[PDB]
Amino acid sequence: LFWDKEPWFWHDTLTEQLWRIFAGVSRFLQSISWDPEDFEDAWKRKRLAVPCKLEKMRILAHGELVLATAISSFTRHVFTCGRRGIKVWSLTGQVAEDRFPESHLPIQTPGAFLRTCLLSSNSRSLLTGGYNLASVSVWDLAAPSLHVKEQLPCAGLNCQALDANLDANLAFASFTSGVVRIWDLRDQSVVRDLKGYPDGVKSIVVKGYNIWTGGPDACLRCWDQRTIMKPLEYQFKSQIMSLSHSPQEDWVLLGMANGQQWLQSTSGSQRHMVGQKDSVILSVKFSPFGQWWASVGMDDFLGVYSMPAGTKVFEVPEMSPVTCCDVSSNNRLVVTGSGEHASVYQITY
Amino acid sequence: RQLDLGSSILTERAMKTLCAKLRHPTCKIQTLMFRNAQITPGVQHLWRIVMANRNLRSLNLGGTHLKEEDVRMACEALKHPKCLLESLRLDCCGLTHACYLKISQILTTSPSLKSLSLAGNKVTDQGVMPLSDALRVSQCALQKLILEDCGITATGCQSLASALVSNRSLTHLCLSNNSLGNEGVNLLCRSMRLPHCSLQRLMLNQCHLDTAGCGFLALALMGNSWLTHLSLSMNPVEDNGVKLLCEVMREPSCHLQDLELVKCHLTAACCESLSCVISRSRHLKSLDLTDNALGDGGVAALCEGLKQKNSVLARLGLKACGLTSDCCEALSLALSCNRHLTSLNLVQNNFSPKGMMKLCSAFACPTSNLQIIGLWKWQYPVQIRKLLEEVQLLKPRVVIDGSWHSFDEDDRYWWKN
Amino acid sequence: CALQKLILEDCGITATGCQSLASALVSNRSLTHLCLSNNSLGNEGVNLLCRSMRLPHCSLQRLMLNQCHLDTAGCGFLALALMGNSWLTHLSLSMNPVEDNGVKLLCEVMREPSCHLQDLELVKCHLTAACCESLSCVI
Amino acid sequence: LTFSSYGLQWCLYELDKEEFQTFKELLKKKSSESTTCSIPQFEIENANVECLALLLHEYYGASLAWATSISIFENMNLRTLSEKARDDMKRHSPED
């Protein structure tokens, strides 16, 4: 949109000409393609190939700073999050830039915000929570009208990260008081509670019977639900900004806020460099097929990297610093958010 | 001329109706394609048109399932004296031994068919021997042959060696993704050392080669002047193998023109040898080095090579080699000096803005004439984009497209498949 | 120069010495024997000797290379040079970590009628059954 | 009956042509090893995705067909489609 000198559609020209006449006074941008057959990309001379292309295809205007983004692919929507509420967009129509959301989700309570969001892997629930709020709410997206179906009680606590695991019906949370709780969606009763670190944990990731967390103290810990044993501590040099766990193999990918990335394996304590940058990374996300990962930073650049060794395929520039990203489940679409806008790209290989 | 089906679920009635309108002599379509479609119920209807129509030239199948009766019908249809079909391509049809026997018989009997491809079929050595026996006869009119994922072994290699020494007609052969090994390489090399061999292009990819296989090929390469192309990609041929090939190719008698090798675990020493070859040789016209950690030293060596005015290298291939600023400066200087290089490629590298400035300035020089360049415009800040557009304005013939294989001849990629 | 034999045992010469001696060998036409023992000439020195011996006017009859840290690469170079030359009659490569592959290469070059190698002694080359089969065919 | 088969077909309509053939081959091997219930081979080879799912339900059984398909999905190294199938089974299979 901005990158081109001017974005234009095929019918735009005819409409402009007819308007000019009435008042008496590649080149053509394309729309996203959904069907899998129409991709028609020849074999290089469901898949594990490494992508080799990008192109912007829309911009989304929210009106205020953007803190978290999510992209559903089973349904086409997208979710943006700001201090005053959440806005739901759509991607079906064709427009250069969007201004009329699909629905607004406001909160009326003095000194009440939101700071985080998270979507279920089935695209059926949406966790929301923030400062000075009564509880963590879950929205029922499968229903013909948005409405909270449950509440997770919490008093005098601020949530700074969320997560879930639908196989066992467990919902997780992290609070600024260094307290990590749990719940059960059947009964909504706290099952356990892990505490002892006032610095707290900025990011938590759940997979199987382990819970990996990290924070400003520059340490990574592992907890197990079954027992009450103490965690396993790993030592690093800088702070940790985000984590993601490969779905295929045993690796944990994180950013160190000094332009470095490291991989950690559960089986044994092994590490190795996979990238270097002059900026500070603010997020890292893993592809649904574990062959590549995306990384959005602070020095106005979006990067894509290759899993086997860590070499970078390419990157795209932007105007404002980015703070979030999210890769679709199709492995095709990747969303990012900077400033007061949320843009959409496409991947072809 | 050309008709294709990118995807479809054809009914038997549908394919019958389509073929009915193609048996008419007024039709003028040369090519066909059904690889991605699903046309299995009506495949039998496809043979009548090739038997009848005279202007049909090519036919491409794929992914379908063929029964013995269908292959017998294909043989009979090919056996009509009136057919002029000059290409066939069977794929993953899951044929049977009797099918290979029938195919060999039609190959020896049919004079029109000048090509054949069998990729993804399970063709064991028992399927290699009948074909070699058909090839031995002096009437065979085959000129190309593709065998992918056939999983042949040394016995197939010696069968092919005997056929090749006996035969005098075949020109292109591709044996890729097979576990031949050093012994098969050696057998083929022995068969090829004779001066009467008439092979012009052979490629062996993923063949589990090693240093010894490269030594055997180099040894059999000396004293030959017909073979013109070769490609050994995705094999752990270390620096030493490339060194042996360079030693063989440094002679004035060799006639090798194109040589590509990807993912071979290369380094700077091979680059020194290849720079010597480029500076001295007089028939090499292409080269490829991808996914190799050539680095600054390697690129500097190749630059010292291409600085020479004698070199006749046409196209060069660099990618994912891990470059930087100083090497890009050196490459820019060399491109300023050279005058024969036309094509080029640089992607999956990390250039600093100063380096990109250097590269555009070098592309600006009137002396150099590069008709293709491989780069991504949008991957850079606006300053760089407008600079590259300015360069594009001068010399309107220049083309800057990141995706290489543009303006590349059709044969290079149509032969392989 | 009127030299016919030259023994240089444990001299510790390098690749540059290889280039010097090989050029001198090519220029000369009197030398017939040469022993270069216990020197880490390596595969690059083997290559320089290979090139200097590739010429058809070379008329040296005997050369030996003991304890030179050879490998399969130098064996490939020697196999390449040996082909097409009928004057060199003796050779030896002892106590080197040559493998099955190097012996196979030497057998392949020697199996043809035009080769005139007469003596070949090798000790401690990590051989196996395959080398035996190849040497049986050669014999 | 139809309710679960619908979700199963939608599970098998994400499969590519080559993936579809590989699935058919694995199923044929499993059936041949099986003696409790025999499935003809020509019918398997001639069937499309919808016919495949309907027949797989018809011979094997709802829960068993879902389990077999999930296992084969895992064998082909298809994880995500397996999880989708498991969840949609949780939501489609009636309580028993």
XYZ file of C-alpha atoms in Angstrom, chain A residues 46-48 74 121-122 124 166-167 169 207 246-248 288-289, chain D residues 10 14-16 18-19 77-81 84 86-87 90-91:
32
model
C 1.637 -30.959 3.906
C 4.913 -29.447 2.713
C 8.233 -28.551 4.350
C -10.387 -21.517 9.508
C -5.970 -23.585 18.541
C -9.442 -24.709 17.444
C -13.430 -21.313 19.475
C -7.186 -27.855 24.947
C -6.249 -31.545 25.182
C -8.766 -28.582 29.493
C 3.443 -28.293 25.957
C 8.719 -26.353 17.915
C 5.734 -28.645 17.263
C 7.860 -31.205 15.409
C 3.066 -24.636 12.040
C 5.469 -27.077 10.338
C -13.751 -32.750 5.595
C -7.162 -31.537 2.938
C -5.067 -34.350 1.445
C -3.064 -33.803 -1.737
C 0.104 -37.970 -3.759
C -0.778 -37.878 -0.061
C 4.070 -37.438 9.640
C 0.867 -35.364 9.485
C 0.488 -33.994 13.021
C -1.795 -30.967 12.683
C -4.483 -32.719 10.642
C -7.936 -31.441 13.999
C -9.189 -35.747 17.153
C -10.944 -32.541 18.205
C -14.517 -35.242 20.273
C -17.162 -32.830 18.997
